[PDB]
Design a protein around this ligand. Structure first.
Ligand SMILES: N#CC1(NC(=O)[C@@H]2Cc3ccc(c(Cl)c3)OC/C=C/COc3ccccc3C(=O)N2)CC1
Length: 215
């Protein structure tokens, strides 16, 4: 793969969001992925709606939790592949309140046809990322809690508990690192982002990597 990829610079990554007091990281990971895949497939970058998943996805458990694979499954099999725009269906569950699913009054911003699950292989991940755009990944986010900045090189890697967005990497660095977009606002980490070492399966980052398919 290329020595370095940063999908932010290429316009496939929206501003950092904030899930708030709701267990919806799974929806933010899924949407960030679809946002990146939709742009890189050749369409204008558009912000898409986590609230659609929080309120309408019947496979997952709204603010109680969920899985990116199940979110992809719901979008394709229950919503005809369609993803509503962030603007037309704003995120209101940041206080943990969960309105009922609202199917009316929105604009469709993107569409997906399937999803893939990537092998548990950092090189396989980097190539698919470099080709297709940002990727949905799960991490053990234990070491995320005290992170101010820098590259994590001894990330607690015991148990997966948090969905994030993989937007890039940089091998021409010492250590080399992945770039991750978190959903804890831009006042956490490196303006919303975190760097973790690439090649040592930091935070169990290789274990559950997925992506929507566009087109
Ligand atoms: N934010 C947030 C919260 N965490 C999640 O939504 C995680 C977010 C999450 C955690 C771990 C993950 C993934 Cl892919 C997501 O990968 C391994 C999967 C473990 C089992 O995850 C679940 C399976 C079924 C239903 C929910 C989960 C789950 O625990 N999802 C606390 C609710």
């Amino acid at each position: 793969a290329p020595a370095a990829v940063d999908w932010r610079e290429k316009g496939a990554v929206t501003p950092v969001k904030d899930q708030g007091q709701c267990g919806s990281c799974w929806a933010f990971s899924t949407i960030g992925n679809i946002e990146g895949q939709w742009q890189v497939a050749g369409n204008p970058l558009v912000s898409l709606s986590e609230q659609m998943l929080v309120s309408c996805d019947t496979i997952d458990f709204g603010c109680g939790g969920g899985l990116m694979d199940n979110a992809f499954n719901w979008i394709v099999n229950s919503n005809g592949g369609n993803v509503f725009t962030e603007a037309s269906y704003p995120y209101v569950s940041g206080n943990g309140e969960q309105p009922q699913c609202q199917m009316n009054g929105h604009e469709i911003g993107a569409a997906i046809t399937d999803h893939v699950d990537l092998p548990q292989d950092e090189d396989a991940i980097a190539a698919y990322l470099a080709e297709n755009g940002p990727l949905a990944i799960a991490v053990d986010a234990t070491s995320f809690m005290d992170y101010n900045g820098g590259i994590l090189t001894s990330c607690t890697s015991e148990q997966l508990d948090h969905g994030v967005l993989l937007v890039g990497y940089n091998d021409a660095s010492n250590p080399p690192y992945w770039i991750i977009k978190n959903s804890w606002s831009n006042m956490w980490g490196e303006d919303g982002y975190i760097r973790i070492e690439k090649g040592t399966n930091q935070c169990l980052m290789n274990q559950a990597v997925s992506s929507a398919v566009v087109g």
